[PDB]
Amino acid sequence: MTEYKLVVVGACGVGKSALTIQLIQNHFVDEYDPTIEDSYRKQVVIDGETSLLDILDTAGQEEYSAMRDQYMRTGEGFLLVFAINNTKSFEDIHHYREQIKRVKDSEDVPMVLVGNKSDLPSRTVDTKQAQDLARSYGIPFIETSAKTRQGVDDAFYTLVREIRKHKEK
Numbered sequence: 001m002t003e004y005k006l007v008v009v010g011a012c013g014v015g016k017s018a019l020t021i022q023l024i025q026n027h028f029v030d031e032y033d034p035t036i037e038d039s040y041r042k043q044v045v046i047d048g049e050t051s052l053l054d055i056l057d058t059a060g061q062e063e064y065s066a067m068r069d070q071y072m073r074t075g076e077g078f079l080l081v082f083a084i085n086n087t088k089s090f091e092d093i094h095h096y097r098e099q100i101k102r103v104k105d106s107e108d109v110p111m112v113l114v115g116n117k118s119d120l121p122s123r124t125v126d127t128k129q130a131q132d133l134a135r136s137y138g139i140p141f142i143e144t145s146a147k148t149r150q151g152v153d154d155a156f157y158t159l160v161r162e163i164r165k166h167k168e169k
C-alpha cells in the first residue's frame with residue numbers, strides 16, 4: 001500500500017491540531033492541548049488510489065535537536081498553516097518554509113499554503129497576499145476552516161497530489 005508522510009506546521013494557535021482531527025475524525029475540537037505532538041494515520045482513496053496518510057501534527061517546544069530534524073526530515077510534504085485573522089502567523093510562514101528547505105536540503109519540497117479560520121469575520125490577511133506568496137513559492141494555496149470543514153479534504157489531498165507531482169519528476 002502507498003503511504004504519504006504529511007507534516008502540518010505553522011504558528012501556535014493557527015489550527016494545526018484542529019485541521020488534523022477534522023481530517024482524521026470528522027469533527028472539530030475546540031480545545032486540543034497545544035503541547036501535544038503526535039502522528040495520525042488514515043486510509044483514504046484519492047483520485048482512485050488507496051493510500052495511508054501519516055499525518056504529523058507538529059507541537060511540543062520550538063527546538064532543533066538532531067532528533068527533531070530527523071523526524072521533521074521524514075515529511076514528504078508539508079502544510080504551511082497560517083490563520084487569516086492573525087498577521088503574525090502569516091509572517092511566520094517564511095520560517096517554516098526555510099526550516100523545510102534546511103532539513104530536506106532541497107528547494108523542491110511538496111508544500112501547500114493553508115489559510116485557516118476562514119469562518120471567522122475578523123480577517124487581517126487578504127486572500128490576495130496569500131495567493132501572491134504561494135505564487136512566489138510555486139505552491140498551491142487553499143483556504144480552510146477546521147470549524148466547518150471547508151477546504152480540509154482539499155488541503156490534504158492537494159498536498160498528496162503535490163507529492164505525486166514531485167515523485168514524477
Ligand SMILES: *CCC(=O)N1CCN(c2nc(OC[C@@H]3CCCN3C)nc3c2CCN(c2cccc4ccccc24)C3)C[C@@H]1CC#N
Nearest residue numbers: 009010012034058059060061062063069072092095099100
Ligand atoms: C502552540 C505550540 C505549537 O504549535 N508549536 C510550538 C513552537 N514549535 C515551533 N515553533 C517555531 O517557531 C516559532 C516562531 C516562528 C518564528 C519565530 N519563532 C518564535 N519553529 C519551529 C517549531 C517546531 C520545531 N520546528 C522545526 C525544527 C526542526 C526542523 C523543522 C523542519 C520544518 C519545520 C519545523 C522544524 C521549528 C512547534 C509548534 C509550531 C509549529 N509548527
Ligand SMILES: Nc1nc2c(ncn2[C@@H]2O[C@H](COP(=O)(O)OP(=O)(O)O)[C@@H](O)[C@H]2O)c(=O)[nH]1
Nearest residue numbers: 012013014015016017018029030117145146147
Ligand atoms: N473559528 C475557528 N477556530 C479554529 C479553527 N481552527 C482552530 N480553531 C480554534 O483555534 C484554537 C487553536 O487551535 P489548535 O488546533 O489547537 O491550534 P494549533 O496550536 O495550531 O494546533 C482552538 O480553540 C481551536 O478550536 C477554525 O478553522 N476556525
Ligand SMILES: [Mg+2]
Nearest residue numbers: 017033034059
Ligand atoms: Mg496543536
